[PDB]
Design an enzyme around this catalytic site. Structure first.
Site, PDB file in Angstrom:
ATOM      1  NE  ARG D  51       4.631  18.994   3.584  1.00  0.00           N
ATOM      2  CZ  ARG D  51       4.671  17.905   2.827  1.00  0.00           C
ATOM      3  NH1 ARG D  51       4.734  18.009   1.518  1.00  0.00           N
ATOM      4  NH2 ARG D  51       4.593  16.709   3.372  1.00  0.00           N
ATOM      5  CE1 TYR D 104       1.559  -5.686  -5.163  1.00  0.00           C
ATOM      6  CE2 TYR D 104      -0.098  -4.364  -4.038  1.00  0.00           C
ATOM      7  CZ  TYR D 104       1.133  -4.995  -4.046  1.00  0.00           C
ATOM      8  OH  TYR D 104       1.961  -4.937  -2.947  1.00  0.00           O
ATOM      9  CG  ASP D 176      -0.266  -0.294 -11.132  1.00  0.00           C
ATOM     10  OD1 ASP D 176       0.909   0.078 -11.304  1.00  0.00           O
ATOM     11  OD2 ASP D 176      -0.659  -0.848 -10.088  1.00  0.00           O
ATOM     12  CE  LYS D 201       6.150  -2.961  -4.827  1.00  0.00           C
ATOM     13  NZ  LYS D 201       4.931  -3.203  -5.579  1.00  0.00           N
TER      14      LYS D 201
HETATM   15 NA    NA Z   1      -2.947  -2.118  -9.616  1.00  0.00          NA
END
Ligand code: NA
Ligand code: NA
Ligand code: NA
Ligand code: NA
Lengths: 388, 388, 388, 388
Positions: D51, D104, D176, D201
């Site tokens: 885990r 972002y 990204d 997204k």
């Molecule tokens: Na980013």
């Protein structure tokens, strides 16, 4: 080792379950799948899982079979589907059923209207009087159907006595054990042939699953699965619902202990209260079938009914004055639930017809939860004081 | 605005759904609950949700109603439960059903064995010949039941013609639209009264939900809900399964487009292949009912059947030689699935009885998925080459 | 009414939760959404939920805040994320932390290696000696960090005394309360500023959720949310995990009662056993800090450590001989779990270094579950007898 | 066979997944577990799943690794956690990062405020000008960080050119790739070292999962897992979220095709509209870096920005007049989402500071969904007409 040898709490936790041999995962994986794949044409023919079965649901069925001391289990989409899958598997046109009259409402509609439209006749009797069951049996009787304790006044049915009667006349005994759970009552150990539950109540216990279970002999369960589910109701349980029920039932023992400990305290409080005319609870020695309850039930349950002084308007005022108890028609949840049938569920029903059904204007039903009993008692006292 | 006015893809995405007014949550919340609470005795009486309904499942039912152009929807525990809840709601002892013979297997068992045991007789006919339906109708016929396209050779049934016949003789037409989905066929628009689906196939599409849906007039659906589900099958869909189906159906339009585009390419490849004796696919002009398909279906579907040279052993070798296609009996999943009924599902069945059922020793059924068609074709070619 | 006024069991069931005002759903809906929608440009600007928050997770955070008697809660992706989100929110390069040495393993790696690489220095001390904490404090000390009880011998830390010391020197006290849960210990009531839990253990309790919680003042929690989660760890809890934790925590009271009742029985059995050299359990009067435990803890917990005669090989033989106890490194589950650190988790670690860490060759750790204590005892006795 | 050899759509469906060898289940089971069990002391030592890994999440990580053509994947609790787990694994006090300015928002806060507080300095540059990246590099630069396309005007960064620059100066390139998904852009194939996504997204695509993924070399991913996740952020993804993402990504290919086909139609409509001053979309030849987009991206994406005539009030009126498009700040969902940053998210920000950030008063951002493009166009036209 074999979980059938262990104590009941150990069984509750472990029976039907094991770590995932492939991965070591302790929680039963959620096999949320419709499709199962074969490695060859030969393996395909051989198996002919199939999603008439599922590994997650299988664990639940095996657990409940252990807990009820039956051979096999079958999970369903709802408690009503457990009941109808059972009875439609067993019965065909021309067959007959003897049923208790004091049964759960939508069971009554299925038996009263649906069954006769398929050519299956049903006689309703007072099952607290085993002689009435005997007198109603016919050469075509396939099934005797009972619920115990039964709504709305928590009357009992002597399972062992009724099983003996049914069997002598060549019928099966099916018992709805929903109110008790296998922690508090084991009908198969008393001679019943088949047990059904709505797991929606105590078995799941968390008020977030609708589902049923059927427990009985392998030979019957196979028929309920391969004919009843497959070819009649289609009422299978989803794997996620099975997984949630597995998870909820882990705490069945400690939950039932607390429900019943709380309920006894509340029942005693209500019995001492001058604005409460009657209290129905198997744990009170004043219960009409008290000694039968002591033999047949390991605990007296988490449900109480009681009558408040002042009839219909008092009952309405009372439930409108609770702050902690939640108004709802379910039972067996972790939260304390309360309802007043005469002003809530049976309001359109004529007063004299309600009365025939054991529902007085002042009757309140209480599903006792896991809250502190002093808090539940204080809430009831508050509402009772206001209402009366 | 009203989603009934928007384009079909817009409906697929939005119909039956809206942001949560309370929170603004765009995804439909999963109302995984059994219990609903009332604010007063009065509100309790008034409503008498109830968990014969659920807000999550309601969204799914409303969406599918929009997509099939019906008034109302009812979700169920399985496709078979959608079928049996419908037919057991409509029919009682003494009633009659005319059914297509070319139907899904466990539908056949329910109609052949279960229904007659409840006093409901069924006549099976070749529904590709509407005159056979007409000739089989009786004063007691309540329902005509058809599936189109139908297993195993993807034969068709002329829905509009059959609806007219059924209606003239005072019966309802129920159509299993599972193979097509509402994206490719709309039986209610052609005169059918009731549509049923196994959402287990294309509507969910992700091979992880067993479930059904029924779509029809509000008056019928109310009966299927308050009598069929409540008092007969108990086959309700769990809210999580409804939520997954809502999620899967979001991509129904783009999935069906790709399934059908892939399937047409594969069907053409198979039709050009000298080791394949026959190819059954509504998209091939050689299909016996090709023009009917063009009027009734907006796309020819994602399912293909075909016969490989060399009978039983060739079919076994072929499915044992695929590397990409997965051996399974379901359909409508994102993965390409393949099966050889004669060596897999119908192996115990006598060869001459299989033959009567349209299942030849060499018949393979293929559910075309969303993989690159060149990869599926290359896999088929590889296995066919080896097997022949 | 206000759940902060009710008894602790009532709070466990109800705090942070209410029926869905929109639908009446009793179970907290699973808001499994990423997207929240605005009704207007104005509402969009106004809110600027956002999925830095979620209605399901909010319920969990509010419940745990009530249970720990703190102002606010913040759920996280794991217990370690609760710890690191807290400490990385509070500390920057040049800051200092005084930490107990007897802490959970991956907390130790974060403090030993990760923090100094960001310019944050940590001094480790024996927190059972509050003077060592005082002596290690520096002008730049922002936080004192403790765990109690602590692995591996269940030693304690006097929370009230340490809080007073930390505060006098201008630092915050953060306490990992994972082993106890708020049912058994309330660090904020004893002067701690912040409590963290791995809900993976007792709070969820069902061995199927990895998650953490942070509880503290609104002013701090806001920073942990809008800076720590948003701009540092990104460790938010998923709504489904929050919903499962809400569901698991419903039974926290009855589970902790049974874990501790079972553990006391088992600890007494082990203390009476001639093949067991030492037993570490706060419920035994022989525990070095017994009286401190009685003041600070309402129950002595469900965890026991003990040393078996015969060192490394005996411990290995013992855990290889259990039939009911499951070999695993977690704790707080419904199943009894057992581990032998020296042969399992710390096998590569040098014997003398293990010894420095309080891990002797014969030390076994036991997480006591909800099974029948006689069954657990019988299993232990069986394995001990064989191993010795 | 090896899914790395198959076509991209085939990989999307199958990579990282296989039927359950134990059961044949086609859907990846949901291993919703915290605890994994060992069969012996020896197996316990040997493994030391755990885990820090999980079979469900492993499937997702392996799939995304195949799709991005990287060695290994690591799932996280959020896109921001994917970014911070990566950068905090790679960087320590004294290290330096060169970052694009057009990134972002919450990435910007982490880089602007969080990193410098840990002694890690960041230089922000215009990454559309690769010379600015080169000029900002320092002996201590460990990482160059870019996003492409970038908010708010969908400007591009030449990945191959930037990778060459970064590598020549001894730094890693992290990209990204959230806006594109691996279906439309593959940074590792262009020389990037590490790719991060918010799966919130397009990868999940269904607006019901918050989560991230990191893809890179095995050696790096091992460090991100065993140090970054374990000892820094604790930001692991829950197995249910992984399972939902696996399910959503099944349709990535067909979804991205439809998003981009719809977006191109809408972008052309907007470019023809006299009330729209500018339209930013890589699919329009008027895009400043159009040819770079054609080489680096297989499709131009599902996101469009555009400026409406009349500034702030026109933009507010426009978004207040849409009937189909939903007002929200996310992207990549099946529903078309629209936002007006100046009146919604950046309203408190000073107009001249917004302007510096490329956010004009009239800028609208649109995430194009799977609805019928004529319906989206008609809705936009309606709102534009009203607003202007
Ligand atoms: Na980013
Ligand atoms: Na019943
Ligand atoms: Na059918
Ligand atoms: Na700790």
């Amino acid at each position: 080792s074999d979980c059938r040898t262990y104590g009941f709490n150990t069984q509750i936790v472990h029976a039907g379950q094991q770590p995932d041999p492939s991965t070591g995962a302790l929680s039963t994986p959620i096999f949320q799948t419709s499709t199962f794949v074969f490695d060859s044409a030969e393996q395909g023919a051989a198996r002919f899982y199939t999603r008439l079965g599922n590994p997650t649901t299988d664990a639940l069925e095996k657990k409940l079979a252990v807990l009820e001391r039956g051979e096999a289990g079958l999970a369903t989409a709802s408690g009503i589907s457990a009941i109808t899958t059972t009875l439609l598997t067993l019965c065909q046109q021309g067959d007959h059923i003897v049923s208790a009259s004091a049964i759960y409402g939508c069971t009554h509609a299925f038996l009263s209207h649906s069954m006769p439209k398929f050519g299956i006749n049903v006689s309703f009797v007072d099952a607290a009087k085993p002689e009435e069951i005997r007198a109603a049996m016919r050469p075509e009787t396939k099934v005797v159907y009972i619920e115990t304790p039964a709504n709305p006044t928590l009357s009992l049915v002597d399972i062992e006595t009724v099983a003996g009667i049914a069997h002598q006349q060549g019928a099966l005994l099916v018992v709805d054990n929903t109110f008790m759970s296998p922690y508090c009552q084991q009908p198969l150990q008393l001679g019943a042939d088949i047990v059904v539950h709505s797991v929606t109540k105590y078995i799941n216990g968390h008020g977030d699953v609708i589902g049923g279970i059927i427990v009985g002999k392998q030979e019957f369960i196979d028929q309920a699965r391969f004919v009843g589910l497959k070819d009649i109701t289609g009422g299978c349980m989803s794997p996620f619902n099975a997984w949630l029920t597995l998870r909820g039932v882990k705490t069945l023992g400690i939950r039932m202990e607390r429900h019943c400990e709380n309920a006894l305290k509340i029942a005693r409080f209500l019995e001492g209260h001058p604005s409460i005319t009657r209290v129905y609870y198997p744990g009170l020695s004043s219960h009409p079938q008290y000694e039968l309850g002591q033999r047949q039930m390991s605990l007296p349950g988490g449900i109480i009914s009681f009558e408040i002084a002042g009839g219909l308007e008092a009952g309405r005022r009372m439930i409108n004055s609770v702050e902690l108890c939640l108004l709802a028609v379910s039972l067996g949840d972790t939260e304390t639930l309360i309802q007043h049938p005469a002003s809530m569920t049976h309001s359109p029903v004529a007063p004299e017809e309600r009365l025939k059904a054991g529902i007085t204007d002042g009757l309140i039903r209480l599903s006792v939860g896991l809250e502190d009993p002093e808090d539940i008692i204080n809430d009831l006292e508050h509402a009772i004081r206001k209402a009366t």
